[PDB]
């Protein structure tokens, strides 16, 4: 059963969680090819592992920048979790290491680019197209939540398309293993649950609210709560009044009403029957959950490819040195990494 699959996955996870892999490679084992994305502590690059010729995505964080941004514990969360998970729609760590200046995490490369890019270009996804992605997220969250993990940054920018048109949920920077409630103000304005905005203790139900935002955005082409400044976005979210495009099917609206529910006692994914209230909603009635998990379903969109390290599905970013100081920075802070 699902319960059986998940208990076994938890046994697997905890072994790695309690005894994390550390220092399993070094920088010069990799050829750096291109920056695929950037962020507050550095970037993610396409790299080639020389010994195998395999391509990977290497995330590089500047330790000093992590420290300035007060993201030390969050970064340690990211690495410790990613080395420990294993799931079809996640990119676990193949390798990690650090040097005087940086932290390095090496993961499976998803060559299809960000969902964000395709969603914006095309405008919006059909309900079947949105459902294919949504199913994969539902399953990932099922997996993650069973391990007492909250993800906390679902959005198109953070969903990578693979060669088969399936998803990888990347960007574990805010992911946290927590039983019960937590309090950090984090996430992305458009996707923040009202509990977060109202500075309450919250739980994994914030991820299910964020799923409502994503499905809405995929199907509409814009999010349910938007405005030029975050404060105005927060005011809309806490009203919770959502308006649906006329093209939204009856079932879709009903799903979204139950995901984008300000009342935690009624929010889908947070009820006594957990994720099954979502899995068994009418909008997903055509979804074969096992076949999605097995990647047997035919993806509604498959990315245009030229080669194994072709990068044409990514935007171009300015390439910046990877500099390594002769002095070790922030040794204590990142000792366990």
């Amino acid at each position: 059963s699902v319960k059986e699959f998940l208990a076994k996955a938890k046994e697997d996870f905890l072994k790695k969680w309690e005894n994390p892999a550390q220092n399993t490679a070094h920088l010069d084992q990799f050829e750096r090819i291109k920056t695929l994305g950037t962020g507050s502590f550095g970037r993610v690059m396409l790299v080639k592992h020389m010994e195998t010729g395999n391509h990977y995505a290497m995330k590089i964080l500047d330790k000093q920048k992590v420290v300035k941004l007060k993201q030390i514990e969050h970064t340690l969360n990211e690495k410790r979790i990613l080395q420990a998970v294993n799931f079809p729609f996640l990119t676990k760590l193949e390798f990690s290491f650090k040097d005087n200046s940086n932290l390095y995490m090496v993961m499976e490369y998803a060559p299809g680019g960000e969902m964000f890019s395709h969603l914006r270009r095309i405008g919006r996804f059909s309900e079947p197209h949105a459902r294919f992605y949504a199913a994969q997220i539902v399953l990932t969250f099922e997996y993650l939540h069973s391990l007492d993990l909250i993800y906390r940054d679902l959005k198109p920018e953070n969903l990578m398309i693979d060669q088969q048109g399936y998803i990888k949920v990347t960007d574990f920077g805010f992911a946290k293993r927590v039983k019960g409630r937590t309090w950090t103000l984090c996430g992305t304005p458009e996707y923040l649950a009202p509990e977060i905005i109202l500075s309450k203790g919250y739980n994994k139900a914030v991820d299910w609210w964020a799923l409502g935002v994503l499905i809405y955005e995929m199907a509409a082409g814009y999010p349910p709560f938007f405005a030029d400044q975050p404060i105005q976005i927060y005011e809309k979210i806490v009203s919770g009044k959502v308006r649906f495009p006329s093209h939204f099917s009856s079932d879709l609206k009903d799903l979204l009403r139950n995901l984008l529910q300000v009342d935690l006692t009624k929010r889908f994914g947070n009820l006594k029957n957990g994720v099954n209230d979502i899995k068994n909603h009418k909008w997903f009635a055509t979804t074969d959950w096992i076949a999605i998990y097995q990647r047997k379903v035919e993806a509604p969109f498959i990315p245009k490819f030229k080669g194994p390290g072709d990068t044409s599905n990514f935007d171009d970013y300015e390439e910046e040195e990877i500099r390594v100081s002769i002095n070790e920075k922030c040794g204590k802070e990142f000792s366990e990494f």
């Binding site: 941004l69 007060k70 993201q71 964000f116 914006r120 405008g123 940054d153 959005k155 920018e157 920077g173 805010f174 950090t184 103000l185 984090c186 996430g187 992305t188 304005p189 458009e190 923040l192 509409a220 082409g221 814009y222 938007f226 405005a227 030029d228 975050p230 308006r243 495009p245």
Partner: peptide
């Protein structure tokens, strides 16, 4: 239209995370 309001907004690009 809502689509037109979105595309004219400053939030159609990649959206940054917030923290504390």
């Amino acid at each position: 239209t809502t689509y037109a309001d979105f595309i004219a907004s400053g939030r159609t690009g990649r959206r940054n995370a917030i923290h504390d």
